[PDB]
């Protein structure tokens, strides 16, 4: 009667945590996600082998509004496993799923994995200046959101960083690279004109993070714009006011111009 | 001449991801530090026989003064590991360490692990609403150090939580409680009266993260402050204002008291 909430990790399926994949391989039934995030390294099958279940895999449709039909009822009588990429409660809305099996009844547990918000770690950008994060969703239609842009510019005035996570449609197959996300922000600067998304912005970009070879490069927007970052996930980032260290890791490891190294104090 | 910085995860041994638990064991030398940060639901001997490998510890001297006497030689002829509790990159000054790595002409990899930074999630508050981070220091002699106490008050002004990771000494295992670090914001509050931290704050208190039974509370510091959360490590965390779903998370999985619903929504 118990319901384990499991990550898997950043890019494949090695990255769960010893905990998770003992405690799956040993539950009855095993549910998982793959649209609140793209696990670029690896395929259901490979899951499934290193588990030993097999595993069924849900909609987001399923889970929002059928999480308590599928899933619950099983754990009601079972030992059932929910996987998700990454951590299960990071940037998603998984987290009220335990208060919809609370409701029902149903113990759970969560086994964390390693996620993109401490992965930004491998950047060399400080993890306790990051403020307020934000996603930069596709315009669809007439809508067109620009909420992400504000982010920024409250953490920069602040001399903070900013974690942009990229849009996903899963279903279409569609990520959003770091490229796309750069071209609707320099949209967005061009309407609201706050100074605070141009040619000259230093941003830096992660790709396929939990990879061994992930791609991390910083620099200007006009000169990374275009450049190639390999195949999704992306995630973007526009660093704060920048410590010497941090410059320096910039420079020394994402490529950045030996320019950003003087720091404006 | 491969360095792997690997993250052993949040509480127990079994906290490493099956990717660096692999590369761990082909590794010729297996260094690591528990000065950061201490795994608390495990003990030294429990990780070198999971890893089956005896495992060199590192003061934080011998890393942040002679990393490059001490671990990169040995990464010029040999595969070495270097562990570190969490994820690895997310303590300050361990970015560095890659740049000291290439200029010695060592190649370095990073294998990811759950951090608190994600982990707090468990607490149903929304990872995009958190600030900047902080530790809280303890005062001492004529120092009396009230940086987070800012930290808080910047980010709740702007709607946004704030972690607050607790002081510790590691080499004498001495763990600041939460409740130690409540009287020490009110003690803070008492002196800037900036209205940021008092008797009616809502604070959540996050203890042993990573294991199966995790300590979840919230409520008033009132009636906080001198409730037993049990062994450490504790983390604080001051919310700002909240969304309905968190705060309807904190009430059915933390006991968050009912009011919540309607104070700080
Ligand atoms: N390995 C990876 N590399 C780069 N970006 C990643 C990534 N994994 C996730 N992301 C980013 O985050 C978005 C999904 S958000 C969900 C995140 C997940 N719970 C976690 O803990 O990581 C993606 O669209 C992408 O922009």
Same mark, same amino acid.
């Given at each position: ?5 499991? /990550? ?5 399926? @090695?990255? &769960? ?29 490979? &899951? ?10 849900? !909609? ?8 308590? *039909? ?16 990454? %951590? ?7 987290? +009220?799923? @335990? &208060? @919809? ?6 113990? !759970? ?8 918000? !401490?992965?930004? /770690? ?6 306790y200046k990051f403020g307020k994060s934000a996603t930069v969703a596709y315009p669809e239609g007439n809508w067109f959101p620009t909420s992400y842009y504000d982010v920024?510019?409250? *953490? ?10 990229? %849009? ?10 770091? *490229? +796309? ?7 967005? +600067?061009?309407?609201?004109? /706050? /100074? ?30 275009? +450049? ?35 720091? *404006?104090?």
């Amino acid at each position: 009667m118990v319901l384990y909430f499991i /990550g898997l990790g950043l890019y494949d399926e @090695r990255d &769960i945590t010893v905990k998770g994949l003992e405690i799956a391989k040993k539950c009855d039934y095993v549910f998982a996600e793959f649209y609140t995030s793209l696990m670029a390294g690896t395929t259901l099958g490979r &899951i499934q082998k290193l588990i030993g279940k097999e595993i069924r895999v849900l !909609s987001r449709e399923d889970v929002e509004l059928n999480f308590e *039909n599928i899933v619950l009822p099983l754990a009601k009588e079972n030992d059932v496993a929910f996987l998700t990429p990454g %951590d299960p409660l990071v940037a998603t809305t998984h987290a +009220e799923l @335990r &208060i @919809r099996a609370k409701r029902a009844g149903v113990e !759970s547990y969560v086994i964390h994995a390693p996620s993109i918000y !401490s992965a930004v /770690g491998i950047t060399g950008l400080h993890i306790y200046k990051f403020g307020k994060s934000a996603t930069v969703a596709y315009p669809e239609g007439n809508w067109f959101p620009t909420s992400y842009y504000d982010v920024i510019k409250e *953490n920069a005035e602040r001399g903070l960083h900013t974690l942009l996570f990229l %849009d996903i449609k899963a279903e279409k197959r569609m990520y959003m690279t770091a *490229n +796309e996300a750069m071209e609707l922000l320099l949209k967005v +600067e061009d309407m609201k004109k /706050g /100074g605070v998304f141009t040619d000259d912005t230093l941003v830096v970009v992660l790709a396929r993070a939990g990879s061994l070879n992930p791609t991390i490069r910083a620099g200007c927007v006009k000169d990374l714009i275009r +450049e190639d970052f390999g195949d999704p996930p992306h995630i973007l980032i526009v660093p704060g006011k920048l410590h010497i260290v941090e410059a320096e890791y910039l420079v020394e490891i994402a490529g950045a111009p030996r320019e950003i190294l003087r720091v *404006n104090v």
